[PDB]
Amino acid sequence: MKVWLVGAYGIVSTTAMVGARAIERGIAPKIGLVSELPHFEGIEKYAPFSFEFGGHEIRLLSNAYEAAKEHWELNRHFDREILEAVKSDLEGIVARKGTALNCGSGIKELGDIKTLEGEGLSLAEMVSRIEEDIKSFADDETVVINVASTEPLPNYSEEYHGSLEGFERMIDEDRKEYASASMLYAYAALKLGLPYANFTPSPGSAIPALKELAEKKGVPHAGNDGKTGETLVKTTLAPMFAYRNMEVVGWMSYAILGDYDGKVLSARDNKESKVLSKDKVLEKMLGYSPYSITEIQYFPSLVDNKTAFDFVHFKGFLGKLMKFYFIWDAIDAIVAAPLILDIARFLLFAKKKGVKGVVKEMAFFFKSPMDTNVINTHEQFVVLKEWYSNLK
Amino acid sequence: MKVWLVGAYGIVSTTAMVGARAIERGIAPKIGLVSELPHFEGIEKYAPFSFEFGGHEIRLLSNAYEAAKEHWELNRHFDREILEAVKSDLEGIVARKGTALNCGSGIKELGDIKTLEGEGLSLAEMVSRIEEDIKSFADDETVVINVASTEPLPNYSEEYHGSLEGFERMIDEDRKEYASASMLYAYAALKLGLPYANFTPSPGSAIPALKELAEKKGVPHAGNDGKTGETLVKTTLAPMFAYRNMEVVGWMSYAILGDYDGKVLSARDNKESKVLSKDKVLEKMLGYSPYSITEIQYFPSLVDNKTAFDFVHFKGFLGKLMKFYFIWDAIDAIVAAPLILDIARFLLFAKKKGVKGVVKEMAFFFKSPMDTNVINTHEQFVVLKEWYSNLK
Amino acid sequence: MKVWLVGAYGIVSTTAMVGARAIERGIAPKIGLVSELPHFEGIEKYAPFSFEFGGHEIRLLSNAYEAAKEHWELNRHFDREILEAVKSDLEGIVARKGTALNCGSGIKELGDIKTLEGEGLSLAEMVSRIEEDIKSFADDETVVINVASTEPLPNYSEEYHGSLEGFERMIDEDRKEYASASMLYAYAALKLGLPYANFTPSPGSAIPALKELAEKKGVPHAGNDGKTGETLVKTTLAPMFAYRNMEVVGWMSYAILGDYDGKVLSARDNKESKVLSKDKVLEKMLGYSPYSITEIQYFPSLVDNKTAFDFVHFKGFLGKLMKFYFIWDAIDAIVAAPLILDIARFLLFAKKKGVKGVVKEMAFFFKSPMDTNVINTHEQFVVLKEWYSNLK
Amino acid sequence: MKVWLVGAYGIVSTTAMVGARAIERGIAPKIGLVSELPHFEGIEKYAPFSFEFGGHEIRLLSNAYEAAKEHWELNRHFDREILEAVKSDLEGIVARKGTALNCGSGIKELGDIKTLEGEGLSLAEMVSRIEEDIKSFADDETVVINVASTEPLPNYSEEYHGSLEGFERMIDEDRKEYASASMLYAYAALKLGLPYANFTPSPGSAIPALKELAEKKGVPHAGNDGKTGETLVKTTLAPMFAYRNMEVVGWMSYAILGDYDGKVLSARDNKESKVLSKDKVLEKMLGYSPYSITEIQYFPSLVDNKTAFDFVHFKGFLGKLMKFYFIWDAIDAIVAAPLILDIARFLLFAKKKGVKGVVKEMAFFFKSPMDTNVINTHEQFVVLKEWYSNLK
Ligand SMILES: NC(=O)c1ccc[n+]([C@@H]2O[C@H](COP(=O)([O-])OP(=O)(O)OC[C@H]3O[C@@H](n4cnc5c(N)ncnc54)[C@H](O)[C@@H]3O)[C@@H](O)[C@H]2O)c1
Ligand SMILES: NC(=O)c1ccc[n+]([C@@H]2O[C@H](COP(=O)([O-])OP(=O)(O)OC[C@H]3O[C@@H](n4cnc5c(N)ncnc54)[C@H](O)[C@@H]3O)[C@@H](O)[C@H]2O)c1
Ligand SMILES: NC(=O)c1ccc[n+]([C@@H]2O[C@H](COP(=O)([O-])OP(=O)(O)OC[C@H]3O[C@@H](n4cnc5c(N)ncnc54)[C@H](O)[C@@H]3O)[C@@H](O)[C@H]2O)c1
Ligand SMILES: NC(=O)c1ccc[n+]([C@@H]2O[C@H](COP(=O)([O-])OP(=O)(O)OC[C@H]3O[C@@H](n4cnc5c(N)ncnc54)[C@H](O)[C@@H]3O)[C@@H](O)[C@H]2O)c1
Ligand SMILES: [K+]
Ligand SMILES: [K+]
Ligand SMILES: [K+]
Known part of the structure; x- marks a missing residue:
């Protein structure tokens, strides 16, 4: 073909x-x-x-x-x-x-x-x-x-x-x-x-x-x-918090890369396209919307090796806060x-x-x-x- | 009831x-x-x-x-x-x-x-x-x-x-x-x-x-x-690799905890009851069974606050290795x-x-x-x- | 007194x-x-x-x-x-x-x-x-x-x-x-x-x-x-690289907090008092200034619990890049x-x-x-x- | 020469x-x-x-x-x-x-x-x-x-x-x-x-x-x-808790690798040239001897890329417990x-x-x-x- x-x-x-x-x-x-x-x-x-x-x-x-x-x-x-x-x-x-x-x-x-x-x-x-x-x-x-x-x-x-x-x-x-x-x-x-x-x-x-x-x-x-990448992960495991009826109160996703793309997706003029893109994503999986941040920064040395750092803050039984971290390389x-x-x-x-x-x-x-x-x-x-x- | x-x-x-x-x-x-x-x-x-x-x-x-x-x-x-x-x-x-x-x-x-x-x-x-x-x-x-x-x-x-x-x-x-x-x-x-x-x-x-x-x-x-905890994350996240026809070459789970269930389970006598649980576990989602180490260890000061560490090593397109880390707190x-x-x-x-x-x-x-x-x-x-x- | x-x-x-x-x-x-x-x-x-x-x-x-x-x-x-x-x-x-x-x-x-x-x-x-x-x-x-x-x-x-x-x-x-x-x-x-x-x-x-x-x-x-916190670890850990003649090609710090301070500094014009810092920090321990980014982000649920993620990219023998991660809680x-x-x-x-x-x-x-x-x-x-x- | x-x-x-x-x-x-x-x-x-x-x-x-x-x-x-x-x-x-x-x-x-x-x-x-x-x-x-x-x-x-x-x-x-x-x-x-x-x-x-x-x-x-690697970080980072009058209540080092030596130090009877050698390391920087587990496991797919996971649990002002994590790759x-x-x-x-x-x-x-x-x-x-x- x-x-x-x-x-x-x-x-x-x-x-x-x-x-x-x-x-x-x-x-x-x-x-x-x-x-x-x-x-x-x-x-x-x-x-x-x-x-x-x-x-x-x-x-x-x-x-x-x-x-x-x-x-x-x-x-x-x-x-x-x-x-x-x-x-x-x-x-x-x-x-x-x-x-x-x-x-x-x-x-x-x-x-x-x-x-x-x-x-x-x-x-x-x-x-x-x-x-x-x-x-x-x-x-x-x-x-x-x-x-x-x-x-x-x-x-x-x-x-x-x-x-x-x-x-x-x-x-x-x-x-x-x-x-x-x-x-x-x-x-x-x-x-x-x-x-x-x-x-x-x-x-x-x-x-x-x-x-x-x-x-x-x-x-x-x-x-x-x-x-x-990081988003595949997010959309693969946010649903875990809905299944367990746990309240995600915050989600942070921070990603860095170099190369042609990251060097252009930097200035918050062109940076806008992947900052709406990862929480209305969440509300459509959890049926509510935690506090969500989503950031990509330039980082030249990483070139195409986009690396992302996620933190999930969530309540469980008796509203006890708990923590989940992940790194995607x-x-x-x-x-x-x-x-x-x-x-x-x-x-x-x-x-x-x-x-x-x-x-x-x-x-x-x-x-x-x-x-x-x-x-x-x-x-x-x-x-x-x-x-x-x-x-x- | x-x-x-x-x-x-x-x-x-x-x-x-x-x-x-x-x-x-x-x-x-x-x-x-x-x-x-x-x-x-x-x-x-x-x-x-x-x-x-x-x-x-x-x-x-x-x-x-x-x-x-x-x-x-x-x-x-x-x-x-x-x-x-x-x-x-x-x-x-x-x-x-x-x-x-x-x-x-x-x-x-x-x-x-x-x-x-x-x-x-x-x-x-x-x-x-x-x-x-x-x-x-x-x-x-x-x-x-x-x-x-x-x-x-x-x-x-x-x-x-x-x-x-x-x-x-x-x-x-x-x-x-x-x-x-x-x-x-x-x-x-x-x-x-x-x-x-x-x-x-x-x-x-x-x-x-x-x-x-x-x-x-x-x-x-x-x-x-x-x-x-961690096993919930594993049975939620492992299928992602399955869906993207990626081959996991290694899965690591190390968890530390204190309190009663800490000392006992760590030694030999009762540690043999959650090691045989996590590659047959993986085999049942990946369809194959990758190098998978599974381990728990005593760590007094953590008490009931089970902290796990996971590293997943997987090949994608062209045989290329990549890494994914998570921490459950x-x-x-x-x-x-x-x-x-x-x-x-x-x-x-x-x-x-x-x-x-x-x-x-x-x-x-x-x-x-x-x-x-x-x-x-x-x-x-x-x-x-x-x-x-x-x-x- | x-x-x-x-x-x-x-x-x-x-x-x-x-x-x-x-x-x-x-x-x-x-x-x-x-x-x-x-x-x-x-x-x-x-x-x-x-x-x-x-x-x-x-x-x-x-x-x-x-x-x-x-x-x-x-x-x-x-x-x-x-x-x-x-x-x-x-x-x-x-x-x-x-x-x-x-x-x-x-x-x-x-x-x-x-x-x-x-x-x-x-x-x-x-x-x-x-x-x-x-x-x-x-x-x-x-x-x-x-x-x-x-x-x-x-x-x-x-x-x-x-x-x-x-x-x-x-x-x-x-x-x-x-x-x-x-x-x-x-x-x-x-x-x-x-x-x-x-x-x-x-x-x-x-x-x-x-x-x-x-x-x-x-x-x-x-x-x-x-x-x-974060900056302590930076001033304590950076020297290590200098001591072993490795070259830091890049360093990231990404902090999140909530509470009064996270609120105030969440504004762009009150945030500026911690951007132009840990570049000139790094050169004062390393003697060259690597590509550094430092960021603080409002994250309400964490309250006064600052949580910082750092990544250091660095070159050693034959200029092979390697990676160091840390999380501060x-x-x-x-x-x-x-x-x-x-x-x-x-x-x-x-x-x-x-x-x-x-x-x-x-x-x-x-x-x-x-x-x-x-x-x-x-x-x-x-x-x-x-x-x-x-x-x- | x-x-x-x-x-x-x-x-x-x-x-x-x-x-x-x-x-x-x-x-x-x-x-x-x-x-x-x-x-x-x-x-x-x-x-x-x-x-x-x-x-x-x-x-x-x-x-x-x-x-x-x-x-x-x-x-x-x-x-x-x-x-x-x-x-x-x-x-x-x-x-x-x-x-x-x-x-x-x-x-x-x-x-x-x-x-x-x-x-x-x-x-x-x-x-x-x-x-x-x-x-x-x-x-x-x-x-x-x-x-x-x-x-x-x-x-x-x-x-x-x-x-x-x-x-x-x-x-x-x-x-x-x-x-x-x-x-x-x-x-x-x-x-x-x-x-x-x-x-x-x-x-x-x-x-x-x-x-x-x-x-x-x-x-x-x-x-x-x-x-x-890992040990370097440790002998570099542990004195920071000393300088700041903090108490380490536990230190975890978990390292995985493959290749020759990872094969070698897997079998328990050779793993023992780095068992006693890491609380006596901590002591020599800290003054006191905190609970401390140091472990190395075989992980074939990593070959010589020794990856390590460290978690320092520590007390500060008013005995409050805090956490620090690092990952060496x-x-x-x-x-x-x-x-x-x-x-x-x-x-x-x-x-x-x-x-x-x-x-x-x-x-x-x-x-x-x-x-x-x-x-x-x-x-x-x-x-x-x-x-x-x-x-x-
Ligand atoms: N995993 C991923 O890399 C990923 C994930 C999701 C989306 N994307 C999207 O896929 C794109 C893939 O680009 P890449 O990662 O190969 O980066 P890249 O810099 O290697 O690719 C962009 C290429 O397109 C060319 N180009 C730009 N504008 C053009 C135009 N108007 N007409 C013809 N050619 C044009 C550029 O010259 C460049 O060669 C990204 O920019 C992004 O939009 C990538
Ligand atoms: N996340 C979890 O806590 C979790 C997950 C999976 C399984 N479990 C199961 O829960 C069990 C206990 O968990 P816990 O967190 O309450 O720890 P725990 O040690 O504090 O609780 C166990 C209690 O049961 C008592 N007990 C022991 N043997 C008994 C026996 N033969 N008959 C009656 N009582 C006995 C002990 O005295 C103790 O008070 C574990 O053994 C594990 O098998 C817990
Ligand atoms: N470890 C740390 O928390 C740390 C590290 C470095 C720097 N700092 C500095 O310490 C500051 C205070 O930290 P915090 O955690 O107590 O936050 P906070 O917001 O609770 O404390 C600031 C307090 O100062 C008062 N204040 C503000 N402006 C004032 C003024 N002009 N005159 C008199 N009082 C005024 C406010 O009412 C508020 O109660 C931070 O904003 C930061 O600049 C703190
Ligand atoms: N960063 C590191 O890799 C590092 C750090 C600390 C300690 N070490 C020490 O360095 C050693 C070598 O590391 P490596 O990763 O190159 O392992 P390696 O297996 O690739 O190299 C060791 C070599 O020595 C040979 N050998 C074994 N016994 C011998 C003998 N008695 N006489 C002559 N040769 C013999 C083996 O054939 C092998 O080729 C380790 O076994 C360890 O004790 C290495
Ligand atoms: K790309
Ligand atoms: K328990
Ligand atoms: K890595």
Whole structure:
């Protein structure tokens, strides 16, 4: 099958690519893959484990391999051995020039960039290129997935984002102030009939205009924002306090990392996107809302090794306060990368079983799962098993 | 309703009584009571939150209040005012001489004991004494619940544990060598047709002879070993790794604690009763069984304040190792006590609804749940609920 | 000896009074007291363990006992019995009205205050009101220690803070814009010719004009800012890395607390008095400044129980990164309170031995020790000992 | 200079050798070297950073590179490029074959082992062989350091370890029962007049006989048992409770690791060279002896990454109990390796200043420093600094 990756030269993206190839050349195991669980025996019928990649980028790198080496140099998140073995495959994967429209202050920090707006094109022209790019690539087994830098919170317009009609008038009128890259990509994907996933907190296909378009074309989509670490933990074990009828009075989650993302998610301008994101999460599991703090800080030396420190303060019998601490030490790309392959496969699966619009039941992969209040990891996993089983 | 507590001047038992009476006196909240959770609404008409207490002990104190105060002095795990407000009630609660039969070398650590065997009695007699004690206290709404100190591994005997007939020939013969307190209390409870629960890892009613007795007498029973702290975290958190097809290469649980259960369990004699519990435990959620060390150690100054340390080492995508740490800081009688009153009510409910034998569906409370492979905190919770909804 | 506490009704200050009295009455041990270490045997020659208290406050409560009861109610940081036994002496301690001048947006967070400038008074009357308050109380064995709420960064002025001439003019020409309470309190202790110590990040006697005052007056003074918890471990543990020629690539401190202080410092403009610190702390022990972050966050449920998480990333042989984690769990007032007395005893000694100006040698007590580069806790202790031995 | 290494194919040893060649090759920096700290400027007039390696082993590996690589495969503790860079240097390093006498059950773990007593040799000629291997290799500027696997407790012979005569009688008389490998190589070193150091808890040169010899021959020597991680933290952190007049009421150290030594110290009978050695550590810094458990468990997946969990429970003002937790995560070979070279450098310096016998002043490097009580890292460092200055 074919995967088109928005932000194709990033760590998550290339680790997923490196990984797809290593597994297919049979020199890496299938650990990490949700689609490779016993319960999903059968899915290779509808979406074999086989991947061809391309994607969009704004960064000035030569091909996927050069990108993967750069990330590997600073993180050694996998055996050098593995990288050298896929050097050739990844070298033949060259990204096409993207758009960074409305991507914020922090885009400097990617180093040297090249954009479609940088060539001085109209919105129509840019949309049109992105479309061309993917279509020349796309077959009937193609999915599009966004893994590009988190955008700020969009310049939200009722006119231009409230309806598909409105969104297209935005394109046609060349009204760039209203568009964000993620919208354009997602539009293009749904526009060409291609399943789309948003792995980021950027708006992507979340706006009503793109949900409308998704529904009308008959195209499945999912998101948003992959639940890969500390949040997976939170949503896996907050429910333990509800089951035991204990009152969580405070929850602290403090996470640190370096690399392109943490260095941008720093300034509380762009820091806003993951501070609402971890307590209304809690009320939807406990049915009340403890005092919750949620923070990410820059910490250069850690690079992609996002580390998180959680404290849970809770009352038990006779209201006695008690304490729970945990530390999460993982490489972000390693926990994310496989989910991109899982999502690609589940989405193709959904396409072929005729699913249209938002795939509620894929909540399991995300922190802002669209169209659902099912947040508790356990219920989510059951939901995904059961959605898979019923359609199979 | 009535609750006969085996080990009744224990900190769990006393905390239970203190909290039952405080809640009833309207002077403490109802946090921690699983039977108080919304899904369990209506349980009141079969098992109201109304409690009377008696029990067996081998410790020499005057009454439950002195026991309670003794633990409270060293522990201060509830407000002094609650202690005073419940004084006259627990002063009215007087345990009856029990049996230390085959309870391990470290029964020396409780210090001052008088026991039924200690009178030079026989099995036939001990048993009639234990029964008379209970029959004395019992109505149609009495449950017997074991929270006595953890017994060593019992001497094995298929003749005497294999079947009711064998056990009863054991009693008849006074073959004390193959008998243990937990068993005799269990036998007594079932021979009077009262529901029975085993909050401890002692064999209790779990031997085949006593399951048969329960079946034949038509009484519900449940256990074993209440799942209160760290093990709750383990059966809640381990499934996460399962859901993300991650391979745990190592699980470490080290816990320190003081108080009575500290010294005894740490040594050799009774430490062999919660080590074989946590890789077969893991095997039943991971589906495989990783290097798993499990250990408890004496640490005086901590008293009843069980502190556990856990390190989980797991591979994700591409074979890449990552680490997860947690620290559980709780007062053990606090997580334990409410579950005693929950086990009570739920047992009275089962009895009223015609349940007999093991109630598998009360696994949610136990570290070694009988007759179930369901160990996942979430699967056990759904199972508890469904059970309830299906008999309600 | 007499001790005059600015911020008299605060937890830190009330706990010191409770401890002072409790130790005098013979109902508490002498743990926590640097002045009570065997090196300082001899000290009671000049600074015995006896204490009379007085103080300024701005909150309306009857006496130091109500002040202490409030704090204990929320915190339960010592036995009910300790409180009860000192009820008498502490009811005999009534704080006199002070100034809340320029003390931040968080002065709103203290509930109901009444203040000297609240009577619409002038800098000159306010100062002499302060001095007359301390002057009745004060004898030839009286010290003044500041434990008031953290002020924001002072309004910068080199005309008014650079010289005592400029400071007295500020007072003469009533320029409240350049004056904060902590400076006014300090000016008064020192004009009245009394030892002064500042246990807070506020300027206090550290403005140049005030050091000038203390020198010209020949008065000893110590400060600033108690090093009671997290920062103690930092100044004790950092050296280890320097001793083994390892390179700290990064250090994080993340503290949470509630209670009055957590409230006040939760505002951004009152938080700033603890961000620009433990970078320049680190370079003063390591000789290079690693990437450091320090943060305090409001966390209501913890009350005065500060809990700090630190992470240190560091390079050793062949530049391999390694990791060190720590969690600090203490009641702030408990660790603060003893030093208050310790400082009082040490200041009164200093004075008696004719010491004048900044007592560099009390660096051991402080996060921002004045006039000194000795930050290393061990180096700091040794100085405190030799300074003392050299005067004994 | 020349360093002869006992256990030359170890991870500590081969990492030291890998590191030394990298630094000389100028392809890695000098992080981790105590001797490269400023206070020692000039140490190299007497002890340049210049190293030639030889040693004793029982494992069958071709040369020092095969060994380094084998460890590297499993640990990836330094860069694959460093290994290639130094391959040819390490390949010229062939270990000469030594003795495994009375190193107990934990020598079956190592693999294919060949020894001197394996040839059915007598103590006389095993020693002779050992001195012949070394003398051959050694010049006026050679050191012997022990980094071999930890022995079980030596067999007790007061006659044979009480005095030089005794010891050499043991040899002439072939009393194999009473010697072990540490003792033999140490004897062998001091006979040839080379300085000796013992990085292991093995007795080595610390028996009265062998220090008798060192004096007699005017040879300097140091040990025992490198202080590399957890214990370092402890000897650094415990004095903070002393300085602050607090009482430690319990200390827990729980360390897990895999690889050779983790295998070795798992079996209970070898775990006992670090059982008595950590309350007597605390005492020597604290004044009193608090409850203190120190434990090490096998954890295969960690390989050489010794992780440790510490919990200090402590009383402060008014007897209030507080908690401190830390987690050390390092690679034991990285923390150790530099100290091997440092130790060699200080030893040559010592030799060259006429120092003889136990050099107590090098305690800084050790867990059980010979002939000294100074345990506190801070004090040890100063002592190390001062000693060097006194002989500079
Ligand atoms: N486990 C995880 O890492 C995790 C978890 C949840 C969500 N996410 C989301 O996934 C994203 C993955 O990024 P990463 O971790 O690989 O960091 P990264 O810095 O390696 O990736 C971002 C990449 O996208 C490119 N890009 C940015 N804007 C673009 C645009 N407008 N058009 C085309 N390309 C663009 C950048 O040049 C960069 O190559 C994160 O930024 C976050 O939004 C990640
Ligand atoms: N979190 C928890 O506290 C928890 C969790 C799981 C299981 N348990 C079970 O609870 C038991 C006791 O816990 P506790 O916290 O009350 O400790 P505890 O030692 O204070 O209580 C046990 C009490 O039972 C008495 N006793 C011992 N043997 C007896 C016997 N044969 N007959 C009658 N009384 C006897 C003892 O004198 C003591 O007073 C443990 O043995 C354990 O098996 C507790
Ligand atoms: N271990 C520690 O708690 C520690 C460590 C370092 C620094 N400090 C400093 O000590 C201060 C007090 O600590 P606390 O725990 O008692 O908190 P707290 O808020 O309970 O104490 C502050 C008290 O001072 C009073 N006050 C405020 N402004 C005043 C003014 N201008 N004049 C006279 N009185 C005033 C307030 O009414 C309050 O009662 C902290 O804000 C901090 O600046 C404490
Ligand atoms: N941070 C640390 O790793 C550190 C700290 C303190 C103490 N130590 C000590 O250092 C030793 C080495 O550590 P390691 O992790 O490199 O273990 P390792 O097993 O990899 O190295 C020890 C080597 O010595 C060899 N050996 C065993 N007995 C011998 C004998 N009698 N003669 C010659 N060679 C022999 C073994 O074959 C092995 O290769 C430990 O056993 C321990 O006593 C190490
Ligand atoms: K990432
Ligand atoms: K207990
Ligand atoms: K770690």
